[PDB]
Amino acid sequence: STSDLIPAPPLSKVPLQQNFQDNQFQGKWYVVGLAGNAILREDKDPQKMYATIYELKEDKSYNVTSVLFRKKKCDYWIRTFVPGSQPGEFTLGNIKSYPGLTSYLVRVVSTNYNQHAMVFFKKVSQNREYFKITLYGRTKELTSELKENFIRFSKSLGLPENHIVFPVPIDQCIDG
Numbered sequence: 001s002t003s004d005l006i007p008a009p010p011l012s013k014v015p016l017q018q019n020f021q022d023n024q025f026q027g028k029w030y031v032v033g034l035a036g037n038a039i040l041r042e043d044k045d046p047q048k049m050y051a052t053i054y055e056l057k058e059d060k061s062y063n064v065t066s067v068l069f070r071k072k073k074c075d076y077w078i079r080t081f082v083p084g085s086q087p088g089e090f091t092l093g094n095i096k097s098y099p100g101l102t103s104y105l106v107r108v109v110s111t112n113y114n115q116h117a118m119v120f121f122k123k124v125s126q127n128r129e130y131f132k133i134t135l136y137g138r139t140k141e142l143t144s145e146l147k148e149n150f151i152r153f154s155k156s157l158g159l160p161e162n163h164i165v166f167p168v169p170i171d172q173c174i175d176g
């Protein structure tokens, strides 16, 4: 394999939501925007919206379930976000169960809990460093202002426009 990636930003360029409220962040979020060094706009076959549900466990980790519509079916992808060094950061539980994965970080960049969130992810897999930012909405649509803010923020982390995608709203799988 050969591979050329935009470098992950230093974490000093990634804000952390002040006074993160883990209980209020729970529930379903729609992925309204998606950007990252391995994310590519594809006009031919556009990315479909998917959803990610955060459930706070008794131990204060999250069970995180993502639901995607692929090949006419609902695909479920489950992981555990374990609280990290400060509130609003997380690491991946059971990292040994993911082959090639040596590092995984989540940082909630901003949210008002009941409409929108921006979340930064960074991982090292097969020794390659990937990062993405998701724009989450409690609904499938968000204002132009929030989408443009997400574009500006993604660009501030070094991502050009073709690495920034707005998944198309769908009704299958993600409406339950």
Ligand SMILES: [Cl-]
Pocket: 142, 143, 144, 145
């Ligand atoms: Cl608007």
Ligand SMILES: [Eu+2]
Pocket: none
């Ligand atoms: Eu992933």
